[PDB]
Amino acid sequence: ERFRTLKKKLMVFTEYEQIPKKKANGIFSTAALPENAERSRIREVVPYEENRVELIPTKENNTGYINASHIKVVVGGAEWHYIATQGPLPHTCHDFWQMVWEQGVNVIAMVTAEEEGGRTKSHRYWPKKHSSATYGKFKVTTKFRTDSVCYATTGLKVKHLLSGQERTVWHLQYTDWPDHGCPEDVQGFLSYLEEIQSVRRHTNSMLEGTKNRHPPIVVHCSAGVGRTGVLILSELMIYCLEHNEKVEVPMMLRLLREQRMFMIQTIAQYKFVYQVLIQFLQNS
């Protein structure tokens, strides 16, 4: 029945179109400040005040503003923490790396190419003879890369220049999203999700059997809501399916939109989540 229910739905237009885009009484005071307008790629997509990612203020960035949201979801006993953010701008790369540093992030899931159809989606905030670049106070060095065609996994070393401390950050870039619509290769997106799962596990291995808080993974696309929402909703719903949790897809999307406005921007994106879930169940 469960499988037949998902396949049948794929009716989804009305289900999607009915879900509110944002919290009714949303507050976004810091994001709305004129000084923070230029820090948003798409002005209309901003974090709610209560769960924006707060950077330690600096002289140039006195509110410690970055267009990024803490997304926290508990499913049964399991707790998920993502930071959903925009593709960095040329003038926010240093903010991005400050965030990754301060939040203890080990994994970045970038669900976009830098440029698509001649349109900029994200700045190149990791190194392209020299394999390093310094963004503000953070030196980033590209160490290795595995290209799996649909996606590529790059190992980065990030050094906080003030303290000399270093961390490995894993950068997982999905490269198969077409200019319009959604990927035809659903299997490749599932494999990308598997790669994220793999990397999160190995980066958190030394926390196993402790009460240490698992750090968030960063998820971004262009504005940090469309494909970013697809990834997060897919991971959560796959978990729900694996553990037979009684959670409906549209209700989980509502929960996500209460934490970051506009998550999942198109019907094609929403339908794609269903395609991902159906293929996951078929694979199982």
**How deeply is 231 buried, as exposed, middle or buried, from its count of CB atoms within 10 A (0-12, 13-18, 19+)?**
buried
Residue 223 labeled ligand binder: yes
Quote the CA–CA distance of 30 and 236 in Å, as a whole number: 29
Closest listed residue to residue 151, CA positions, set 99, 208, 190, 121: 190
Residue 78 labeled ligand binder: no
Quote the CA–CA distance of 169 and 250 in Å, as a whole number: 33
115 strand-pairing partners: 120
151-160 vs 166-174, strand pairing mode = antiparallel
Residue 265 labeled ligand binder: yes
182 flagged as catalytic: no
3-state helix, strand, coil in the chain (%, to 5): 35, 20, 45
Contact 11, 270 (CB under 8 A): no
Domains and CATH numbers, the chain: 1-284 (3.90.190.10)
| Active-site option among 93, 150, 182, 221 | 221
What distances in angstroms separate CA 114 from CA 9, 88, 167, one per listed residue?
Answer: 34, 10, 24
Contact 25, 19 (CB under 8 A): no
- Beta strand residue intervals within 175-238, DSSP E: 217-220
Residue 108 host element (H or E): strand 107-110
Please compute Rg for the chain using Cα positions: 18
- Measure the CA angle with vertex 43, ends 42 and 49; round to 5°: 115
Number of Cβ within 10 Å of residue 197's Cβ equals: 12
